[model samples]
Target: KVFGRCELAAAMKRHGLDNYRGYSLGNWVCAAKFESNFNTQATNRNTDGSTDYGILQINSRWWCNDGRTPGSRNLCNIPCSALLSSDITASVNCAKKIVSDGNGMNAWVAWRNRCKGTDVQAWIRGCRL
Candidate 1:
């Protein structure tokens, strides 16, 4: 699903994303914006032959299996396509698992490169959450 910034922020808030796994809601909001523009259908092929899937861009290398990326751990035990749905429950759950695996938001390169250490208030500036 394509969500406006506020819409996505509210959704994330409802999902109890604020301070989830010790990461701020703004961090997740910013990560999603940079990772997929809040597009659940987003996918990107990586230079390493792995692919990033869904709103959080969970990686095939360690998270979900896409059937094409070899040696995927399938830690989430769900197909990569499962993350592409407009319903973000599975994607969010998988992302939680990823963060629990000790990667935190750094699991997403976009988070590391663009969202981390940045003032992310703009990501949810108008969301009253």
Candidate 2:
């Protein structure tokens, strides 16, 4: 199932989360928009584009290429070209842990937990990537 099309649905359902096309598109859209400006092609610079790769802007040459621990080598290490190749679950799972160190909500919890008690638009604006 490389580049699985139904990955989002599968990830959401597995975590008992909302459906993007159903009721959670807004939340997902908001997070991705702020994090990467919906540009899966976006890339961050470590001193003027010394290295670059991946959809989520993962620097494969530095992170994955070096073979680090519990990150690019473990999970959410999709190459830049295949950023959205998998389902949204991969992205959501990686993000949830990255933020809260596995203390935050799962993908399902991300939409509900982050969106709770805050205006979605405003929250996204204040979120420090």
Candidate 3:
């Protein structure tokens, strides 16, 4: 399912993304906006032959195990397919794990290029969460 912006804001805020690791909930929402446009099934192939999956586009390289990406750490200890669920809770958990690994939002280039050093709060404007 593709989520509307405000819908995603509430959902993400519910997942405790607000002020996670000093990044605001809007930062997480901004990342998801550029990464997948809030589409739960979004995916992309990487040059290293790994893939990014789901709304936050968690990479198979160090996050999830797709069984096709070489040397994947499966650090999140979940199947890559789990990221694609419309429920989004699993993806949210894995994303928290990612930031806790010292990468912060820098783990996603999309966030760096599109969401970083900007007025990220705009991403959640009109969302009352």
Candidate 4:
């Protein structure tokens, strides 16, 4: 039987994602890093009764409190970094789903370039992943 970690990695690979790769993994990690330094259980409560939590900085109420809506599953609720989760593939897939207009890797590259002011794709190629 596939161990849970292997299963999660395989699932992510099937979806064309890796933490070291473009859209799903890169952007999600980038967002998390920006929001909360990649802290999985990060949370902040606002006066408006809203709360942001988890590595992806996913807002809890949308996934936990609201009635089951047809939306991205909140693996953030798992309370572990995506790299440590038993079902990380779900979170990566959810981040991919949030990418605009069905465009994939290019979008991530654009974001990376914009934020870091460097050609991220070339850097990625050098990393040999």
Worst 10 residues of 3 by lDDT: 99-108
Per-residue lDDT of model 2, residues 10-99, tens digit only: 343455334333334335444444434545445454553333332233444433332332233434455444544434444554544444
Ranking by TM-score: 3, 1, 4, 2
Q: Write the per-residue lDDT of candidate 4 for residues 10-97, one digit (tens) a residue.
A: 4444566654334433343344445445444455654445455444444433433322233534433443233234344545555554
Instruction: Return the lDDT, model 4, position 79.
Output: 31
Candidate 1 global CA lDDT score:
0.87
Residue range with the least summed lDDT across 10 consecutive positions in model 1:
120-129
Off by over 4 Å in 1: none
- Model 1's C-alpha root-mean-square deviation from the true structure amounts to 1.2
Clashing pairs in 2: 54-80, 55-80
The TM-score obtained by model 3 is 0.97
Rank order (by lDDT, best first) = 3, 1, 4, 2
What lDDT does the true structure give each of the candidates? 0.87, 0.40, 0.93, 0.42
Candidate 1 per-residue lDDT over residues 1-129, each given as its tens digit: 798888888878888787998888899999999999989899999988899998999899888989988777999999999989987888888888888887778878888999899998767777877
Prediction-by-prediction clash tally: 0, 2, 0, 0
